[PDB]
Amino acid sequence: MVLSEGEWQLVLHVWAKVEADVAGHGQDILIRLFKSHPETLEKFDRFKHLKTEAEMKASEDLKKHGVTVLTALGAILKKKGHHEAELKPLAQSHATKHKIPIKYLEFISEAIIHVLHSRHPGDFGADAQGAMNKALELFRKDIAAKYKELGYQG
């Protein structure tokens, strides 16, 4: 489903606030993912030793990864749907090396929404959350199509 410019602007105006401190947002989002759906942590050989939220919060390398994740996602969002070039390497690594099912991409989308909702009520009212959800649905739909092309049933 194609987003309107108005919807993209709601997405980008909350992303602008994420970008005040991407590192802290990335910690919150990865931690929320791992707490809400612990099976997702097991996909990270790099991080699955972390036992508690405290350990997660103290991990500089998890923080680093959260910045990488959110910056990659931000670049995708800023393309406003024209994200074919960005999705290719992402889909290929996530299909073939990391083996991340679409269901787990749903889980991180949920975590993103939850953190934005908590942190940014001024820029994440119902319409803005709907726009973000549409953007993440488009991301997951297009990633799923690439997964199929790449041979992964996701």
65 annotated to bind ligand: yes
| Cβ 49 to ligand HEM shortest distance, Å | 12
Helix (H) or strand (E) holding 28: helix 22-36
Q: Are 115 and 28 in contact (CB under 8 A)?
A: yes
Q: Nearer Cβ to ligand HEM, position 7 or 26?
A: 26
| Cβ 34 to ligand HEM shortest distance, Å | 9
| Whole-number Å distance between alpha carbons of 118 and 29 | 11
**Cβ neighbours of residue 145 under 8 Å, at least 6 residues apart?**
none
| Cβ 122 to ligand HEM shortest distance, Å | 23
Q: Nearer Cβ to ligand HEM, position 120 or 154?
A: 154
Instruction: Write out the two tokens for 77.
Output: 């969002």
**Cβ neighbours of residue 137 under 8 Å, at least 6 residues apart?**
1, 109
Which positions touch ligand HEM (CB under 6 A)? 40, 43-44, 46, 68-69, 72-73, 90, 93-94, 98, 100, 104-105, 108
The SS3 of residue 130 is helix
117 annotated to bind ligand: no
Q: Nearer Cβ to ligand HEM, position 75 or 122?
A: 75
| Cβ 6 to ligand HEM shortest distance, Å | 23
Instruction: Write out the two tokens for 97.
Output: 């090396």
Q: Nearer Cβ to ligand HEM, position 29 or 128?
A: 29
What letter represents residue 139's amino acid? F
Q: Which residues does the annotation place in the binding site? A: 65, 94
Q: Which residues does the annotation place in the binding site for heme b? A: 94
